[PDB]
Amino acid sequence: MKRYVVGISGASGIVLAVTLVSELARLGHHIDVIISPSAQKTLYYELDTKSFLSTIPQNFHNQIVLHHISSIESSVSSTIDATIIVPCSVATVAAISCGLADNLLRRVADVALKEKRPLILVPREAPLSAIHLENLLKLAQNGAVILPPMPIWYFKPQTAEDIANDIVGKILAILQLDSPLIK
Amino acid sequence: MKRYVVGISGASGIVLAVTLVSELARLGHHIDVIISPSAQKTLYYELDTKSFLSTIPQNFHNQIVLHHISSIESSVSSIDATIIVPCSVATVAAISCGLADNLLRRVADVALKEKRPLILVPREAPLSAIHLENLLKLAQNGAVILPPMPIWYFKPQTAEDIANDIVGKILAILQLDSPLIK
Amino acid sequence: MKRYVVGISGASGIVLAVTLVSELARLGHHIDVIISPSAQKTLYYELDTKSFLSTIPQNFHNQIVLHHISSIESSVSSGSNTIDATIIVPCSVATVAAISCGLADNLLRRVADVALKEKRPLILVPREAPLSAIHLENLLKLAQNGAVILPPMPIWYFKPQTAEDIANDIVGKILAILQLDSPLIK
Amino acid sequence: MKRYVVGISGASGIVLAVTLVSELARLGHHIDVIISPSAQKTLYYELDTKSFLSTIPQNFHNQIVLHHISSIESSVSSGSNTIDATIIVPCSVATVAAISCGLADNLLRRVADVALKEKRPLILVPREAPLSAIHLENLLKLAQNGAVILPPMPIWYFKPQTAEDIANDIVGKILAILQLDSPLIK
Amino acid sequence: MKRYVVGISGSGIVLAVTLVSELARLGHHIDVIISPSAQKYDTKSFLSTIPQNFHNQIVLHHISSIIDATIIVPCSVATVAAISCGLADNLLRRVADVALKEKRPLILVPREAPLSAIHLENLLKLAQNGAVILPPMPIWYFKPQTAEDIANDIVGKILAILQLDSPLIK
Amino acid sequence: MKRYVVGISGASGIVLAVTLVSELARLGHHIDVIISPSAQKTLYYELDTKSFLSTIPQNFHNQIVLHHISSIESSVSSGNTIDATIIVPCSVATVAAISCGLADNLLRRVADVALKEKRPLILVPREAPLSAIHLENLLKLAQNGAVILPPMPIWYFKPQTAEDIANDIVGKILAILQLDSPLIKRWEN
Amino acid sequence: MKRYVVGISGASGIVLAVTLVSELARLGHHIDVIISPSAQKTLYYELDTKSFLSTIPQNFHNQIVLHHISSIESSVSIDATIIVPCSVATVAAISCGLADNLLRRVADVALKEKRPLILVPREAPLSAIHLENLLKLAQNGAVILPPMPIWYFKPQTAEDIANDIVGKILAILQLDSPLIKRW
Amino acid sequence: MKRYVVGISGASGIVLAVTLVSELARLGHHIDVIISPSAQKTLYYELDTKSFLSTIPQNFHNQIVLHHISSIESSVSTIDATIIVPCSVATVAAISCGLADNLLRRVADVALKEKRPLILVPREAPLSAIHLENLLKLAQNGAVILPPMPIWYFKPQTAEDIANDIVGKILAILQLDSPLIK
Amino acid sequence: MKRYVVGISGASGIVLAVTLVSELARLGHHIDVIISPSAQKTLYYELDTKSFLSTIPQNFHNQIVLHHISSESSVSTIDATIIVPCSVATVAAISCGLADNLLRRVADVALKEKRPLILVPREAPLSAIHLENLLKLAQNGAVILPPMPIWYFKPQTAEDIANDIVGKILAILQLDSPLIKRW
Numbered sequence A: 001m002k003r004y005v006v007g008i009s010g011a012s013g014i015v016l017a018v019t020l021v022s023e024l025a026r027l028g029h030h031i032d033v034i035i036s037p038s039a040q041k042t043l044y045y046e047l048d049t050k051s052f053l054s055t056i057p058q059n060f061h062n063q064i065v066l067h068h069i070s071s072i073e074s075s076v077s078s079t080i081d082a083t084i085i086v087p088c089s090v091a092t093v094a095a096i097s098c099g100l101a102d103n104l105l106r107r108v109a110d111v112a113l114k115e116k117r118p119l120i121l122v123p124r125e126a127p128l129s130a131i132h133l134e135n136l137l138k139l140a141q142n143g144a145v146i147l148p149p150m151p152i153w154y155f156k157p158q159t160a161e162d163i164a165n166d167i168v169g170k171i172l173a174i175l176q177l178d179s180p181l182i183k
Numbered sequence B: 001m002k003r004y005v006v007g008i009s010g011a012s013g014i015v016l017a018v019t020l021v022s023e024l025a026r027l028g029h030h031i032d033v034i035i036s037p038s039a040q041k042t043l044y045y046e047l048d049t050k051s052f053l054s055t056i057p058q059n060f061h062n063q064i065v066l067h068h069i070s071s072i073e074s075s076v077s078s079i080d081a082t083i084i085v086p087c088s089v090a091t092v093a094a095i096s097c098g099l100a101d102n103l104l105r106r107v108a109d110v111a112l113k114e115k116r117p118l119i120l121v122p123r124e125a126p127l128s129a130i131h132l133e134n135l136l137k138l139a140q141n142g143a144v145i146l147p148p149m150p151i152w153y154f155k156p157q158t159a160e161d162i163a164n165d166i167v168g169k170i171l172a173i174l175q176l177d178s179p180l181i182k
Numbered sequence C, D: 001m002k003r004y005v006v007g008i009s010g011a012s013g014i015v016l017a018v019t020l021v022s023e024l025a026r027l028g029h030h031i032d033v034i035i036s037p038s039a040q041k042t043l044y045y046e047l048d049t050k051s052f053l054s055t056i057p058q059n060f061h062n063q064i065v066l067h068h069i070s071s072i073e074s075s076v077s078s079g080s081n082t083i084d085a086t087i088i089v090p091c092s093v094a095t096v097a098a099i100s101c102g103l104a105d106n107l108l109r110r111v112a113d114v115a116l117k118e119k120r121p122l123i124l125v126p127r128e129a130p131l132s133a134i135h136l137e138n139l140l141k142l143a144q145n146g147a148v149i150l151p152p153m154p155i156w157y158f159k160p161q162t163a164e165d166i167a168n169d170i171v172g173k174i175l176a177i178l179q180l181d182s183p184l185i186k
Numbered sequence E: 001m002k003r004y005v006v007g008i009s010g011s012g013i014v015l016a017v018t019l020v021s022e023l024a025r026l027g028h029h030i031d032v033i034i035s036p037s038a039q040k041y042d043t044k045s046f047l048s049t050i051p052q053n054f055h056n057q058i059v060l061h062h063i064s065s066i067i068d069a070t071i072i073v074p075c076s077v078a079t080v081a082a083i084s085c086g087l088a089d090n091l092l093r094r095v096a097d098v099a100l101k102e103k104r105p106l107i108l109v110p111r112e113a114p115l116s117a118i119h120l121e122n123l124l125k126l127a128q129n130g131a132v133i134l135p136p137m138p139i140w141y142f143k144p145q146t147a148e149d150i151a152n153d154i155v156g157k158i159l160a161i162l163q164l165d166s167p168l169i170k
Numbered sequence F: 001m002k003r004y005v006v007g008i009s010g011a012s013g014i015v016l017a018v019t020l021v022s023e024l025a026r027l028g029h030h031i032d033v034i035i036s037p038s039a040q041k042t043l044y045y046e047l048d049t050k051s052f053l054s055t056i057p058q059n060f061h062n063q064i065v066l067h068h069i070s071s072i073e074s075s076v077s078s079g080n081t082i083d084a085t086i087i088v089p090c091s092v093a094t095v096a097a098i099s100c101g102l103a104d105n106l107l108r109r110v111a112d113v114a115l116k117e118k119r120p121l122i123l124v125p126r127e128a129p130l131s132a133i134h135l136e137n138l139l140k141l142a143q144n145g146a147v148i149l150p151p152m153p154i155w156y157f158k159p160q161t162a163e164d165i166a167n168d169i170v171g172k173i174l175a176i177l178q179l180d181s182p183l184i185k186r187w188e189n
Numbered sequence G: 001m002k003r004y005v006v007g008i009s010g011a012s013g014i015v016l017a018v019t020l021v022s023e024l025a026r027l028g029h030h031i032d033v034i035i036s037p038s039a040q041k042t043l044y045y046e047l048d049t050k051s052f053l054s055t056i057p058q059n060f061h062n063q064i065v066l067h068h069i070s071s072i073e074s075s076v077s078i079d080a081t082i083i084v085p086c087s088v089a090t091v092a093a094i095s096c097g098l099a100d101n102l103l104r105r106v107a108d109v110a111l112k113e114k115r116p117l118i119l120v121p122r123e124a125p126l127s128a129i130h131l132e133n134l135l136k137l138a139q140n141g142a143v144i145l146p147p148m149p150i151w152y153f154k155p156q157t158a159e160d161i162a163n164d165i166v167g168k169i170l171a172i173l174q175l176d177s178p179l180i181k182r183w
Numbered sequence H: 001m002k003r004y005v006v007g008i009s010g011a012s013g014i015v016l017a018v019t020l021v022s023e024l025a026r027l028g029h030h031i032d033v034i035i036s037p038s039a040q041k042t043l044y045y046e047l048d049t050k051s052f053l054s055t056i057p058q059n060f061h062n063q064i065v066l067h068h069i070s071s072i073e074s075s076v077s078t079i080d081a082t083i084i085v086p087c088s089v090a091t092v093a094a095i096s097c098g099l100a101d102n103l104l105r106r107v108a109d110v111a112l113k114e115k116r117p118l119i120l121v122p123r124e125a126p127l128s129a130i131h132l133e134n135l136l137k138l139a140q141n142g143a144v145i146l147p148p149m150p151i152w153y154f155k156p157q158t159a160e161d162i163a164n165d166i167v168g169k170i171l172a173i174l175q176l177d178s179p180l181i182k
Numbered sequence I: 001m002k003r004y005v006v007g008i009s010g011a012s013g014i015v016l017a018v019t020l021v022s023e024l025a026r027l028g029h030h031i032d033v034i035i036s037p038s039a040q041k042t043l044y045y046e047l048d049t050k051s052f053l054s055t056i057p058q059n060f061h062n063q064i065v066l067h068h069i070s071s072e073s074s075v076s077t078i079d080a081t082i083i084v085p086c087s088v089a090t091v092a093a094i095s096c097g098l099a100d101n102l103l104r105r106v107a108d109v110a111l112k113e114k115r116p117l118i119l120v121p122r123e124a125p126l127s128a129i130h131l132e133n134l135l136k137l138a139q140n141g142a143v144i145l146p147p148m149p150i151w152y153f154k155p156q157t158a159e160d161i162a163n164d165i166v167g168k169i170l171a172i173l174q175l176d177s178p179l180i181k182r183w
């Protein structure tokens, strides 16, 4: 029974976080989830709800703890098998690359780097400027896994859901879990 | 009319290049297409065809010119925009180094040399420090770094919807009106 | 049974590849071997043969798969497929250069680039002398990206007698890094 | 007798390599020549032959050995065989890039990398215009590693009249770098 | 009628003469700035090299006197050095600096060989700040016959970057 | 007669220093030799003697001067005209010291002197694997003009014995010194 | 049983090395200990003894091997290497690769073999020169663990502060120990 | 009365250290002196003595305290300035690296750490790129880099005139008034 | 007969240039001498004369050619170039590539052709800006040779110190001269 921290930042593609958290729980693990106010908006615009938990089957709720973005005092903010920021806005990328650990989402990423525990970042921004590429580079040189949501067309997806599933499968493979989402 | 150069490199997502060349042809423009041998393989694994032109409406073919990857002597290697789509990280690395030793890499080098639009659509994951360093260098030298990332706020339903919206973003950066843009 | 990728680049010392692949098979493992055209020439000039398989005892051949240098579509070329460690032995400065730049445009360079981006073990056995500033910068950059830089340095405190002893003990160090127990290790 | 290696890469100005090799042979020296496939095409479009030897007096052919571009096993591929200087002329930016990376995966690139590692003279005659930041960075790195960067720029204070005058003066400056006495120097 | 600045830095003044007069033949205005180093003859005045009917279109400036594009041709390494440092302390240098400061075209035609690491670093820095680095490379696949052919094709390369049309462009 | 400095640093392969010094003296040259305390240990472990001079034919001793590692006042610690300086073998620690300019014993000083006078310095560094820290020091030294010559065996010369491999490595050193020695071999076809 | 190397360099806080070794031995492990000459001075000024082993319960002495600092040829020269306390001079040497005594050598071997290396550097203020060396060592895999007091554990005594600092070392070694405390 | 630290490193020019310490004591100041083993050798070769105090008038000895090089414990390890003179490139290298593993290197490190004056009088010729980088690094961290350059515009006649005016330059940097400054 | 360029920049120590030129001429060599306007005044202050040639023996004048700092000249192949003394302004100009007078050009030509360039900079203290310029020139092949007295030769007179410094220059020139003494 592994323990994961999933930080959800306000970039497009919150379905990726929904799918990842569902599958992590369906495989029996524990997830601490931190939703930023911008991801809260993205949740409404992209998935038509204001409750992240309503997107997750109810029997898995005892495996998910929501933490408020301001709780830098929380016990995730100080053991954890991996931390995943998905989706990850370039503003959150910039903060983590600076060390600017002044909310809980940014703190859990800094803690993963400080303890050399896995930190997977799923940035979504296009086009990518030189400023953002330099922050991404700096994070990769400090051991962050940089995993943009790149569709895998040789699995010949038919639906949008297929494309999301295969992207989450790649996150799970980086996490070294066996999931049927991995092709 | 406008003239475009589309280099197709051996990353996943050839459907993106099909869609782009198809729409550019449909708008009345000319496209010089350069297909790498790796892209020729990906064309088979992803679109179950060994002929690139068999995926474009036959009426458009008089607007498309296929160039062999080794024709470094070619006329395009001396104009409106150059698009490498999809773009492997090996081809990213070659362009970032200036290693213009085939026709695809040379048309990219020429765009950077002349300050003409170069759009790269790199696809790889994860992206290591080596590839990010190459990406950064190209962005600093004026290349538009446009990874094919799905636009979920358009609420796509099909895989084809996702490819169409990605290509719409390329068309928008080329500042062309197109139904593929939202 | 573990799975290993062995890239054979055209530097001097192909005997190192031969004895490494042979020992990996003898311990029961599976080896995917990628031979560059230059290493194919070095095999001839150094081992007087044109067939790499001809240097491996025959019962081991079922555990070895040869892959063409151009087969970038190979299943070993995907990160999805789990490899225990990738060894480029011997490794030319040309291939060091390509890997350090990200120039993953043949299968040998690609399997090395795949191990880097997946943070799986990549052992390079570079052989060149002298080492120029340009080579040392490429090696430095690969070490900073997690590759193990293992030049084939003779181990003289094992008091070798024959040229084969020097080679065996170099391969013993590769096997030590791989976390394997082997009679080649001292 | 001194021994030179001349690498001919696919940039414009193949006449410079003809003139240099002819003069080096006239002066009695030995020249190993490596013509890339792109330079073969430039030879036809600029000098209307497909045979580099045809542009040199036949009485000098005994001082010249042509090597295929893929022949990285050639004697001039090793640092053990002493070369007095290596000249890449003309030099495309693709080849500058390869040499600046250490990408020694053909004989022309290998020849240049061997000069840098042995610290023997390497003269590059790069031709491209304009020069982008990417290309200038490669040139810079090569100059910092000891390469002589000699772009083929006309020497107008000699008041050339003909195109051949300009080519001859430029080759004169290479020979001056080689510290060779020659009537093409002024 | 466009307005071009041609700065003549201290070998290869034939390139500047060829550019200025072709710009003039195309109906444009040229502000020429000649360094003392470039004034150092086989002719006394630079205006004597341009056809006289073009003279109303050309204005000479003293280099010690405190716009579509700026071309420095030929361009010495000291002038490259000064511009790359921001050392805008004569008229030639500060008109180059103005073009870099306003993101206007600056075409540099350096004629030094060999190029040492110090000069390459200055060129690189200028390229990274948007200057066009255009060394005078003969084009050869045009099969030039005279020295005059080679000069004209080099100037045609300048005009092409200026996005002008001219029979010098081949 | 040329004049050489051989520094013997405490890494594996002291047979390389024995072979080089012997061949330099056979050619008729003079060698100032400096042996670190670590190399003295390695001499014992690898060659089973505590006397470096016992490994060299006695008729050559008149061409060889041993210097104590702490004699920074020695004649060879001053930029006296030396034709080449070789540290063989060369530990990564000594590489580190030289690359920092930490010229606080005679072996490191002799290397610093070669660098400041732009006279040849050959380093025969031996260590495996090489970390990023060591690669960076090696890089720095190469950019400052040191020849970085790790003792890579030369298998295209089809060696049969350990001695063959050592001899060919020393032959590569002699080829960089631009000396004409039978230990040097050259590539063929 | 695991095997540890504890290098003791001449910085203030030698109590930290006493505590770490005692507890590692109490858990059943083997410790090779290297004391620099300056740490022997520090041991005298701070703990009033010239015998490191006089500070360790005698039943643990069979698990401890003391090495001389000049024994560069030692068999040590496996599970983790801790330099505690670590002087800035030792930080400087290790960051340079100046592996010219046994203490500097075992740290360099840890970095070369990519085994754990924990440095407990003690110096204040930290100049730019020392920060640069610390940065380099962190970028090459070393764990940089300055002996920062953990005040939210509300210590009463100086011993409390030393125990919690060692407990953090133990946590990084992924050992379980009654010195460790959870926030 | 002010307090100075004078480290004597093993480069040529130990007369400068003798002249400096003796003049600081003549002004009534206190000097802690640290002599490296190498400087002990150069004392012998350059000044025909094996006792540093023998070069100083005996009446000033009560203001001078000698410290062993290995004595990294010491109250010197409140100080008005620290002067390493002469300073070998090896000592420059150690200080630039933070290799504070003897008392001379340590007092220099302490001055840098506390932002107190550190004057280095390095003596070596030529200065290689390695030495210049270390010098640069030290200047960037606030050390004063004072190579012992003869002041010819004072028209010296003797070797002692040259050494005196060099020390006068140190004294000036120390903000002291002395007849050694012209 | 070798051919030297000696550039005389405006800094203290022109006696070094005087005794270098006369020793080069005494050995039978040819010297092109370039004297800056600032060096001419230092010549009168330090040597009590307006005429550089009045400090050189008249038998040597036929081996010396004086060039004006403002001149197109032919020194724009040489066995070596020495800038002695070398002011910080001259060092800065050469390190920037600012080759806009004959003295700067001759130094630039030496670097471009990879021929010996010896700089004798005389500034104390050396600021970070000046050390950076010096560093850049040493990396580009220039020999940085400050006039450092050689006290282990136990000089007695000011001229002794000056002659031994020029001896070091002559050693770097690989000239066998009786001004050179050896350790």
Ligand SMILES: Cc1cc2nc3c(=O)[nH]c(=O)nc-3n(C[C@H](O)[C@H](O)[C@H](O)COP(=O)(O)O)c2cc1C
Pocket (backbone or CB within 6 Å): A008, A009, A010, A011, A012, A036, A037, A038, A039, A041, A042, A045, A046, A088, A089, A090, A091, A092, A124, A125, B153
């Ligand atoms: C629907 C929606 C989608 C967004 N998508 C992205 C995106 O894909 N990439 C990005 O950089 N910002 C995106 N943004 C803007 C980010 O929310 C913005 O940078 C924000 O301040 C980041 O906040 P956070 O990272 O703390 O959650 C999006 C905003 C909205 C409302």
Ligand SMILES: Cc1cc2nc3c(=O)[nH]c(=O)nc-3n(C[C@H](O)[C@H](O)[C@H](O)COP(=O)(O)O)c2cc1C
Pocket (backbone or CB within 6 Å): A154, B008, B009, B010, B011, B012, B036, B037, B038, B039, B041, B042, B045, B087, B088, B089, B090, B091, B123, B124, C072, C073, C074, C104, C105, C106, C110
């Ligand atoms: C089916 C298939 C999919 C591939 N997808 C990618 C990819 O997404 N990204 C990548 O960098 N390489 C990918 N490759 C490998 C590249 O094609 C390979 O590195 C090649 O040498 C690049 O050459 P090119 O860029 O000239 O086409 C793929 C290969 C195959 C066969």
Ligand SMILES: Cc1cc2nc3c(=O)[nH]c(=O)nc-3n(C[C@H](O)[C@H](O)[C@H](O)COP(=O)(O)O)c2cc1C
Pocket (backbone or CB within 6 Å): C008, C009, C010, C011, C012, C036, C037, C038, C039, C041, C042, C045, C091, C092, C093, C094, C095, C127, C128, D072, D073, D074, D077, D104, D105, D106, D110, F156
């Ligand atoms: C017999 C032989 C030995 C060689 N040894 C080396 C070597 O030790 N190091 C090296 O960098 N190149 C060596 N080469 C040259 C390389 O083969 C050449 O750089 C080649 O292009 C590298 O290709 P690869 O890395 O793709 O195999 C050798 C070539 C031959 C024929």
Ligand SMILES: Cc1cc2nc3c(=O)[nH]c(=O)nc-3n(C[C@H](O)[C@H](O)[C@H](O)COP(=O)(O)O)c2cc1C
Pocket (backbone or CB within 6 Å): B072, B073, B100, B101, B102, B106, D008, D009, D010, D011, D012, D036, D037, D038, D039, D041, D042, D045, D091, D092, D093, D094, D095, D127, D128, E141
């Ligand atoms: C006629 C002709 C002239 C060329 N001139 C140049 C040139 O001047 N500079 C350049 O970078 N490439 C030039 N190229 C293209 C290069 O050949 C191309 O970059 C090639 O891949 C370089 O390969 P190579 O240097 O190994 O021959 C030219 C090509 C042709 C057909």
Ligand SMILES: Cc1cc2nc3c(=O)[nH]c(=O)nc-3n(C[C@H](O)[C@H](O)[C@H](O)COP(=O)(O)O)c2cc1C
Pocket (backbone or CB within 6 Å): D157, E008, E009, E010, E011, E035, E036, E037, E038, E040, E075, E076, E077, E078, E079, E111, E112, I072, I073, I099, I100, I101
């Ligand atoms: C005949 C002659 C030709 C010259 N050619 C060049 C040249 O080709 N490249 C260069 O950098 N300097 C050349 N110079 C010297 C430059 O003019 C020198 O760098 C000058 O000081 C720069 O001043 P300016 O750029 O302000 O004109 C030449 C000088 C003369 C007399």
Ligand SMILES: Cc1cc2nc3c(=O)[nH]c(=O)nc-3n(C[C@H](O)[C@H](O)[C@H](O)COP(=O)(O)O)c2cc1C
Pocket (backbone or CB within 6 Å): C157, F008, F009, F010, F011, F012, F036, F037, F038, F039, F041, F042, F045, F090, F091, F092, F093, F094, F126, F127, G072, G073, G074, G099, G100, G101, G105
């Ligand atoms: C038998 C033996 C072999 C050694 N081999 C090496 C070696 O190959 N590489 C290395 O870096 N250190 C090696 N060492 C350790 C070094 O000698 C150690 O770092 C030493 O302090 C270097 O000192 P020196 O260079 O001043 O002689 C070896 C030690 C011994 C006892």
Ligand SMILES: Cc1cc2nc3c(=O)[nH]c(=O)nc-3n(C[C@H](O)[C@H](O)[C@H](O)COP(=O)(O)O)c2cc1C
Pocket (backbone or CB within 6 Å): F072, F073, F074, F077, F103, F104, F105, F109, H008, H009, H010, H011, H012, H036, H037, H038, H039, H041, H042, H045, H087, H088, H089, H090, H091, H123, H124, I152
């Ligand atoms: C007479 C004599 C003069 C020396 N002069 C210098 C010198 O001028 N510069 C230098 O860097 N080293 C010089 N050295 C050698 C240094 O003492 C040597 O590098 C030493 O290891 C540095 O130790 P230290 O600076 O800690 O005293 C000299 C040695 C002697 C015997």
Ligand SMILES: Cc1cc2nc3c(=O)[nH]c(=O)nc-3n(C[C@H](O)[C@H](O)[C@H](O)COP(=O)(O)O)c2cc1C
Pocket (backbone or CB within 6 Å): G008, G009, G010, G011, G012, G013, G036, G037, G038, G039, G041, G042, G045, G086, G087, G088, G089, G090, G122, G123, H072, H073, H074, H100, H101, H102, H106
């Ligand atoms: C009682 C005492 C306490 C010390 N504390 C420190 C310290 O906290 N930090 C430090 O960098 N040096 C400290 N030192 C000085 C170091 O021991 C000195 O820098 C030495 O050169 C480092 O030696 P090492 O190789 O054992 O690390 C202390 C010395 C003494 C005597």
Ligand SMILES: Cc1cc2nc3c(=O)[nH]c(=O)nc-3n(C[C@H](O)[C@H](O)[C@H](O)COP(=O)(O)O)c2cc1C
Pocket (backbone or CB within 6 Å): H153, I008, I009, I010, I011, I012, I036, I037, I038, I039, I041, I042, I045, I086, I087, I088, I089, I090, I122, I123
């Ligand atoms: C009497 C006198 C002595 C000078 N001494 C020096 C000196 O020792 N070092 C220095 O950098 N500048 C010195 N200068 C000032 C420089 O000459 C000044 O920077 C000058 O403008 C540089 O020009 P030049 O070196 O090309 O002649 C001195 C000036 C004068 C009047």
